[PDB]
Amino acid sequence: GKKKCIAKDYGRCKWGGTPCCRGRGCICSIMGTNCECKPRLIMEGLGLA
């Protein structure tokens, strides 16, 4: 029961810190502070990246 990851589910997430059970889309702003967990993957479309 999330007892192996986090409870935030989405939003504040850090690959090197606060894990992200659901939504691996953990990206931060240019400054690297607005690290939010999004459900969307790396592909900003279909499979171009």
Curated annotation (Swiss-Prot):
One of its GO terms (cellular component) is extracellular region. Keywords: Calcium channel impairing toxin, Disulfide bond, Ion channel impairing toxin, Knottin, Neurotoxin, Presynaptic neurotoxin, Secreted, Toxin, Voltage-gated calcium channel impairing toxin. It comes from Agelenopsis aperta. This is Omega-agatoxin-Aa4a. Disulfide bonds join 5-21, 13-26, 20-37, 28-35. InterPro entries: Spidertoxin. It comes from the Eukaryota. Omega-agatoxins inhibit neuronal voltage-gated calcium channels. This toxin acts by modifying the gating of the high voltage activated P-type Cav2.1/CACNA1A channel. Is a potent blocker in both insect and mammalian central neurons. Belongs to the neurotoxin 02 (plectoxin) family. 03 (omega-agtx) subfamily. GO terms for molecular function: calcium channel inhibitor activity; toxin activity. The keyword Metal-binding does not apply. The presence of a 'disulfide through disulfide knot' structurally defines this protein as a knottin. Pfam families: Toxin_9. The keyword Kinase does not apply. SUPFAM superfamilies: omega toxin-like. Expressed by the venom gland. This toxin is a diagnostic ligand for P-type channels Ca2.1/CACNA1A in the mammalian brain. It is found in: Secreted.
